[PDB]
Structures are given as C-alpha cells and as structure tokens.
C-alpha cells in the first residue's frame, strides 16, 4: 500500500538478485535514485533483468510484458507512483524492441522510465 512498504519489497528483490551478480551497493542505490548509466556493464543490466523477472513483468522469452506490468502497477504501486508509472509504460513499452539481449531490454526499459519520470520512479 505505502511508499515505506514498497521500499521494503524493493529491498527484498534487491537482496534476492544482487548476490548473483558482480554488483556493489553504490551502483544499486544509484538505480534506486533514478541514476541509470548509459553504458553500464553487463552485470548491472542483467541485475535489472533479474529484478524485472522477480517482479513478474518479464516473459519466459525475456520480453517485458505490457499486461503483466500494468497489472503489477495497479496491484502494488502507491498512488504517488501509479499514474506516472502507467505513463512511463506507454512511453517506454517499445524501448525493448531495439534490443536482442533480455538484460538490455530490461535495463534500458527501466532507464527509459527513470529518465521519463524521475520524480516518481524508484528501482529495486
Ligand atoms: Fe541501497
Ligand atoms: Mg561494475
């Protein structure tokens, strides 16, 4: 329901994903603050895919699901974030088509949303 609760849930996705990858707290918290590097290394991008998968927004094929993302937005996000998240999804749903690598699809879709609505966006 709340922002505080969302943060906790995001921390639980981070802790489940970050160990798998060669990634440090400094980088991860940058993502949480809407700071998405343009040229990250493969580990940061694949971390972002791990998050998306965990959040239930990615398909087995490694694509970002519009319907699943909408459902998660509506089910989970606080009102502070909800409407801007829907707009960011409209704005960014095609970002993935430019990328074969699912890690790229997930990372650059998330960067798209961060750069579009930095006031509201948080990343786990
Ligand atoms: Fe952090
Ligand atoms: Mg690195």
Q: What is the number of other CB atoms lying within 10 angstroms of the CB of residue 2?
A: 10
Q: Which two tokens stand for residue 68?
A: 């699943």
Ligand 2 (ion): which residues have CB within 5 A?
41
What is d(CA 105, CA 99) in angstroms, rounded to the nearest whole number? Answer: 6
94 annotated binding-site participant:
no
The residues whose Cβ lies within 5 A of ligand 1, an ion, are: 29
Note whether 103 and 46 are within 8 A (CB).
Answer: yes
Report the first-to-last Cα separation within the chain, whole angstroms. Answer: 16
Please name which ligand lies nearest the alpha carbon of 43.
2
DSSP string, 73-94: HHHH--HHHHHHHHHHHHHHTT
* Surface-to-core class of residue 25, CB atoms within 10 Å of its CB (0-12 exposed, 13-18 middle, 19+ buried): exposed
Can you tell me which residue has the tokens 């990250």?
40
Report whether 25 belongs to an annotated binding site: yes
Q: Helix 66-76 to helix 79-92 angle, to the nearest 10 degrees?
A: 170
Residue with tokens 């798209």: 112
What is the distance between the alpha carbons of residues 124 and 111, in angstroms, rounded to a whole number?
13
**Length of the chain as a residue count:** 124
Distance CA(96)–CA(102), nearest Å, equals 8
Residue 37: nearest ligand to its CA? Answer: 2
Nearest to 46 by CA among 31, 66, 65, 67: 31
Where do we find the tokens 């060669």?
Answer: 22
Taking phi over 0 as left and psi of -120 to 50 as alpha, with beta for the rest, 105 belongs to alpha
41 marked as part of a ligand binding site: yes
């Amino acid at each position: 329901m709340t922002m505080k609760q969302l943060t906790n849930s995001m921390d639980m996705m981070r802790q489940a994903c970050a160990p798998k990858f060669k990634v440090e707290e400094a980088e991860l918290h940058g993502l949480r603050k809407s700071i998405f590097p343009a040229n990250p290394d493969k580990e940061l991008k694949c971390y972002a895919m791990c998050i998306a998968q965990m959040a239930g927004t990615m398909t087995k094929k490694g694509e970002i699901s519009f319907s699943k993302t909408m459902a998660q937005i509506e089910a989970m996000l606080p009102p502070e974030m909800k409407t801007m998240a829907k707009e960011a999804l409209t704005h960014c749903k095609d970002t993935q088509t430019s990328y074969k690598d699912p890690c790229d699809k997930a990372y650059f879709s998330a960067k798209c949303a961060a750069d579009f609505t930095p006031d509201t966006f948080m990343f786990p």
